[PDB]
Design a protein around this ligand. Sequence first.
Ligand SMILES: N[C@]1(C(=O)O)[C@@H]2[C@@H](C(=O)O)[C@@H]2[C@H](O)[C@H]1CSc1ccc(F)c(F)c1
Ligand SMILES: *[C@@H]1O[C@H](CO)[C@@H](O)[C@H](O)[C@H]1NC(C)=O
Length: 503
Amino acid sequence: KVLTLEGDLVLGGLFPVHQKPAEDCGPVNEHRGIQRLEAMLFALDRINRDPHLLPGVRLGAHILDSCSKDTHALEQALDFVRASLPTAITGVIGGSYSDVSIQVANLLRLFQIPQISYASTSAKLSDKSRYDYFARTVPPDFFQAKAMAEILRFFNWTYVSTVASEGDYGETGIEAFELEARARNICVATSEKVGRAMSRAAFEGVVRALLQKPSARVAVLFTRSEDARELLAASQRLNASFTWVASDGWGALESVVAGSEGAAEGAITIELASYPISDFASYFQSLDPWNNSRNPWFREFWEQRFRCSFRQRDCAAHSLRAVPFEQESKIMFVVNAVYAMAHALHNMHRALCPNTTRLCDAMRPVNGRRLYKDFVLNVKFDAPFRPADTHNEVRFDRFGDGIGRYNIFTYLRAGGRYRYQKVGYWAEGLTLDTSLIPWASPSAGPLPASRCSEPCLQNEVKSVQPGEVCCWLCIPCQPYEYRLDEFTCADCGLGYWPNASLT
Ligand SMILES: N[C@]1(C(=O)O)[C@@H]2[C@@H](C(=O)O)[C@@H]2[C@H](O)[C@H]1CSc1ccc(F)c(F)c1
Ligand SMILES: *[C@@H]1O[C@H](CO)[C@@H](O)[C@H](O)[C@H]1NC(C)=O
């Protein structure tokens, strides 16, 4: 099964239609697969009826299933390229998973095929020596580490402990954080990692490790949802008071804060900022297995979601209408990637084919290099189906990374039941309404400020510790010594004595 829609230019598409033994393909991914695949189809449908976006050129599709596996994505992604090894794939919209996009980016570069991922967030994909044909509507997770460092440097939380989940996400994220911390003069009290299958009592060890240096109340979490939950419970179980500053791993999930509400309180969490797209909800909820023949996996998905069968007769009776619709996090990015391609091709067409709306000879075939370098990257448009309020834009930096805009959430105790409130955002600079954070807003006691050392006295000079540069002991100058610097005393002589003001 492969999805093929006839068009003048054809877009390839990659979605993890199935989850990952001899089986590359398991259950239907009803949200990251079916919902996002249907969103690309939805976008094409609209582009194809839009008179300002390629009126003459009809966009086709050749959609493939990655099966949430790089190797299965590559076998499939061969379809895209054999069209040059007689209509070709003009550009690929896809890779949900980063490993999936890296695999497909390594193949498409050899055929100058532009590619826009709508979910691959690996910092690795920003390397244009490797991925020169790759852009993404979603920004790398290394941007949320920059924002985290900006939060601590604002609250002046200089001595902080850091926790990272074992993987590409945890390791690369925390590394970018430490780098942004060092340039903002923030010291890592204790670096910590959290492996895959760590036991209930194992995660409790990590809490005692962070408490070994108890002067740092701020814990910077760059963990996966699974770890951020198990660590929060091992913090509550041992009853540990921590000022969490977490990544979108934790995000604004009611799932992460389970039973450990009081322990999670005051936590600052970052979460990639999206909105539900208009019209897709009713597009999707109106899909039925009889009329949606074009999507080969729709009948497969139907039987899954409603737990019915074609032979069992009671299958058509259901509708995606009866079940309340929850629009997948990255739907917005899918549709922006499809429009970023539709626009790039449109602008290229406006430049190469000025005497016709028809696809001219200068674009038969499309030079993918000219398409990626001169049109995909230079795209700048008002995001399609954006909320009526917003003036949300679609553009890419030099490396094709999405323009990184995130939401900041604090954990609150509503008068009782515990919730998350958006306190600020990170556009290209941190912004946050401090009156919306409870441990700041009423000036109810001093800030939770985490520092290893408090400042030295008048008669004291701060002697720094050979290790960490943010730590010092308060050593006093001899009575025959005055305070020259703030880390150095000096002899007054032989007959001379220091001034009552350490001068
Ligand atoms: N951005 C992804 C990528 O593959 O780069 C892509 C997502 C998608 O298509 O929804 C898949 C993965 O979930 C994610 C891994 S990064 C990641 C971010 C937040 C976490 F909490 C976590 F644990 C890992
Ligand atoms: C952080 O430190 C600066 C410089 O001492 C100070 O002006 C600022 O008010 C501090 N911010 C907070 C919120 O503590």
